[PDB]
A paper describes a structure:
DNA methyltransferase DNMT3B plays an essential role in establishment of DNA methylation during embryogenesis. Mutations of DNMT3B are associated with human diseases, notably the immunodeficiency, centromeric instability and facial anomalies (ICF) syndrome. On the other hand, although DNMT3L also binds and stimulates DNMT3B in vitro, it is dispensable for DNMT3B-mediated DNA methylation in embryonic stem (ES) cells. To characterize the structural underpinning of the DNMT3B-mediated DNA methylation and its dysregulation in human diseases, we determined the crystal structure of homo-oligomeric DNMT3B methyltransferase (MTase) domain.
To investigate the structural basis underlying DNA methylation by DNMT3B homo-oligomer, we crystalized the DNMT3B MTase domain in the presence of S-adenosyl-homocysteine (SAH), a byproduct of methyl-donor S-adenosyl-methionine (SAM), and solved the structure at 3.27 Å resolution. The crystal structure of SAH-bound DNMT3B MTase domain belongs to the space group of P32. There are two DNMT3B tetrameric assemblies in each asymmetric unit, arranged in a parallel fashion. Each DNMT3B monomer is bound to one SAH molecule. The tetrameric assembly of DNMT3B MTase domain (hereinafter referred to as DNMT3B-DNMT3B complex) is reminiscent of that of the DNMT3B-DNMT3L tetramer, with the two DNMT3B monomers associated via the RD interface to form a continuous substrate-binding interface involving the TRD, catalytic core and the RD interface. Two additional DNMT3B monomers are attached to the RD interface-mediated DNMT3B dimer through the FF interfaces, with their potential DNA-binding surface positioned separately from the two RD interface-related DNMT3B monomers. Furthermore, the FF interfaces of these complexes are similarly mediated by a helical bundle: in the DNMT3B-DNMT3B complex, the two FF interface-related DNMT3B monomers each present one pair of α-helices (α4 and α5 in DNMT3B) for helical packing, resembling the four helix-bundle formed in the DNMT3B-DNMT3L complexes. Near to the FF interface, the loop harboring the catalytic cysteine C657 (denoted as catalytic loop herein) also shows large conformational difference: Residues N652-R661 of the catalytic loop are untraceable in the DNMT3B-DNMT3B complex but adopt a preconfigured conformation for DNA binding in the DNMT3B-DNMT3L complex. In the DNMT3B-DNMT3B complex, these interactions are replaced by reciprocal cation-π interactions between DNMT3B R670 of one monomer and DNMT3B Y665 of the other.
Numbering used by the authors:
A (entry chain D): 569 to 651, 662 to 853
B (entry chain E): 569 to 651, 662 to 775, 787 to 853
C (entry chain A): 571 to 651, 662 to 784, 787 to 853
D (entry chain F): 570 to 651, 661 to 774, 787 to 853
């Protein structure tokens, strides 16, 4: 942290503040974090677990250039689309990411560094993936969390962060297999779970809808605290505002894999203040 | 400057080649004119009436960046949307124009002149009009042909052409009212025809009658018998002219390009 | 001391006669047409700015009318292309009677010219019969000598130098590639005879024109050139391919009618 | 004063009513050319007139070279064959009469007298009556034989003969009523026969049709004028049914005496 400043981030579709969490877990000094989220449950998680440092705004469709020019400047712009295709409904929110990203980019004649990233699910009509790549002038890299977690989570990542397209290597602290994410006296029938959506149908193996955990000879679904270890979140990250299996699995099912995002944000320690 | 060159233009959704027609009438040298059009009847009009000077390609969807670097460079990129909204069906062809326009833009910092234009009708959702303004980073200038032609054709013009908000004035040769565009022994009830896509406008021999194809051509400012090509009857001639630009509106927009490219 | 020509054209069609007299420079003082096609009437009414006095079905033209509209210096007619004494063929007799009513009274030296066209494809007895009525033998004139299309037609009449052999002019477009628009190659040099039905374009059934490697039928503006009509002569009253090919298929070859009317500059005013 | 015999071409001559009327009229006939194809009809005028009538053939085979050879002619006459109408079938044989008539007319400006006549039935389409008048440049005069014979025979007569509209008067020798035409012991129920369902004649209180000799007196022909070439009841009535009425023609031809030689 020499002659550099704290980072100034604009996270759209921020969810449960995965981005702010990683910048802190890396030790990057976070000067400003602007989140555009509508889920009042998701908003509760970042407001509490990060002690109101995140400046929450509102629906991304009501953000204007005048706002981007005032809240800014931004060093980082990140967005993860909501998991009808592109030009219909929720998918066409990407264009709201497109415009705010362009409004945030440095003006002609400002060589200052500017990084961005946009995640989207791998399950996507190839006409759409080809289209986003045309808008962003950039081709995605597929990063599967299986290499760094105990879950299949294939996602496409556009952007320009240093060493994105670098291949993924695990760390010694990553709970690599399901038995490492489980609580006491729980035996994982498998090693890697299938992809996890918001619905409970994603917790049982695809072929016969079989439970992945066996406690006391009887099969059981995963607990909420065990989902948090699978996605790399801190334990009890989502124990907020009286949420049950319903919400907790919704907020996590939509989320990023934290060890994946840390793989992308790790080189940002080079360009901004750290402590 | 003074050492100018002929103009290199890519025209998407070209139709009946109003852009090339307005250019040669303006007196500007055209070195290349690349057109993207899929209507064989429309293709035939610009192919015949301009002696193959127009390079046709195909469906704009099949144009890649390699094509733009082969056929380029370009000084002018012009496009007119096909009149469900923007994000569905034929409205979303605009994004194809959006990418090919950005592909064709000069290299960053290249001081060469480069101008573009995009047209769309006013009968458009305000949500789509704003979104196009957000994509192009530009606000439309509305120009109605009523001031220069005998037609109601209000349209939005996105672009960076010199002086687009310039006031629209008529020429000495602009056929302003309907009676100036009619064939022999025909009298016009009206003086400015409403839009073309329930009283008849023309009375001949005391019997009401619709306009003729040759009369539609004079209304939009096209040369007479401009659409008499490829056995097209009243049907095709009307839909081609119905979807087409008004010539004096375009000549108004393209006029200041003479001070940037060659002439004669 | 000559005066403008006064002509009565029966079965007038698209006013080929008026168009040719004009292109010759003969001053026309009165042109009385008998035509029923509302499309054809529109073509001569517009292209000649209403100088042609249209009347109607020839069967309602009476002697009292010929004496009112007259005198006539030229009386021309082309038959509708079942034989003579049946159907539309026997309209020739309506031409026969109006011609004789238009003739100068016994004791009038004034010049009087007439003409009657009919198709070569005709019963051998019907050709003898018309020639018996008109006291005149026909001369076969084929547009193929002056145009790019076979058009064999018989011409009864008494115009100066009809039976003269046909020779081409410097501006006649004799081969098909002279009548085509841009980027079109003619597989042929001379088209077979053209009729109203669309099958006249396919050569007994090859398309005559090739564009972009794909063969195509003739366009309308190319038919106008093949017959010698001015281009866009039939682009009138929202007519599509249906009417244009119908009117031109029945039409006269303009370079042929010019051949016959050219010596009439000697007998009437010209400017 | 210095007149000559009459040179006549009769088309569709039938049983030669023209040559009969001319000699009965007292007019000197120098040449009579007839176009007829019925061999029985041909036989009547050949025998009843001792070959003075020059028969040629079907009118359709008569060319202008013939009309110049056999001519000149002073009289051209023709009766139409009596329905498809004019422009179909036997109606259009009129046009063959048309051209041969105009072939025979004098050179344009020649003052010599030339007379023609065309006959057709009143049972005619008005459109064909109008067309024939347009061709001939002439309007027909209707003459019914009822005024001079004992029959209904109304026919149109196109032509240029002197006084064709002249009022029809009967002569002292015209057999006017049916009883005057009948053989012995036969009584006529009627006074005038309709054109050629009760019987007209009653012989010995029994009904009976007319005899061939009685038909010959009805049309004004000489008695036994058709007793030629083994002709039975059928043929004689056919020829007489299609014939002219002799007194009607004599009416038309009477004024020719003041133009040609009479003896
Ligand atoms: N119209 C809108 N404006 C702003 N945010 C929206 C939105 N519609 C959906 N969102 C939010 O976008 C988020 C996308 S899910 C992904 C969020 C992030 N990757 C995470 O780790 O949680 C959801 O939480 C949803 O609430
Ligand atoms: N998918 C596609 N690719 C290329 N061109 C298309 C297209 N779909 C429609 N078009 C063409 O785009 C035109 C839009 S109408 C506008 C034509 C033009 N403004 C003029 O002055 O004539 C239509 O003629 C249509 O044929
Ligand atoms: N009964 C009638 N009275 C008047 N004209 C008629 C008619 N019947 C047919 N016609 C016309 O006669 C024409 C014969 S076609 C010949 C027209 C002329 N030769 C030309 O160059 O166009 C047709 O146009 C037809 O409309
Ligand atoms: N093709 C033809 N050429 C010459 N004569 C013909 C003919 N066809 C029919 N005819 C004749 O025309 C005649 C019509 S009957 C009229 C004959 C006359 N009126 C009389 O007094 O007898 C018939 O005798 C018939 O034989």
């Amino acid at each position: 942290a020499a002659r550099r400043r704290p980072i100034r981030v604009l996270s759209l579709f921020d969810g449960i503040a995965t981005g702010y969490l990683v910048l802190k877990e890396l030790g990057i000094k976070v000067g400003k974090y602007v989140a555009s989220e509508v889920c009042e449950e998701s908003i509760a998680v970042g407001t509490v677990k990060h002690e109101g440092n995140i400046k929450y705004v509102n629906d991304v469709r009501n953000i204007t250039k005048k706002n981007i020019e005032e809240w800014g400047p931004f060093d980082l712009v990140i967005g993860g689309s909501p998991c009808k295709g592109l030009y219909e409904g929720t998918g066409r929110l990407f264009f709201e990411f497109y415009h705010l990203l362009n409004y945030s980019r440095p003006k002609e004649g400002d060589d200052r560094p500017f990084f961005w990233m946009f995640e989207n699910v791998v399950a996507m009509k190839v006409g759409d993936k080809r289209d986003i790549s045309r808008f962003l002038e950039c081709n995605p890299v597929m990063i599967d969390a299986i290499k760094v977690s105990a879950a299949h989570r294939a996602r496409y990542f556009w952007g320009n962060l240093p060493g994105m397209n670098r291949p993924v290597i695990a760390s010694k602290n990553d709970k690599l297999e399901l038995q490492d994410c489980l609580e006491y006296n729980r035996i994982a029938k498998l090693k890697k779970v299938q992809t996890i959506t918001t619905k409970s149908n994603s917790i049982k193996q695809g072929k016969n809808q079989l439970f992945p955990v066996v406690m006391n000879g009887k099969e059981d679904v995963l607990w909420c605290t065990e989902l948090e270890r699978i996605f790399g979140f801190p334990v009890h990250y989502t124990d907020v505002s009286n949420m049950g299996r319903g919400a907790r699995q919704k907020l996590l099912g939509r989320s990023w894999s934290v060890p994946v995002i840390r793989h992308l944000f790790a080189p940002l320690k080079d360009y901004f203040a750290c402590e």
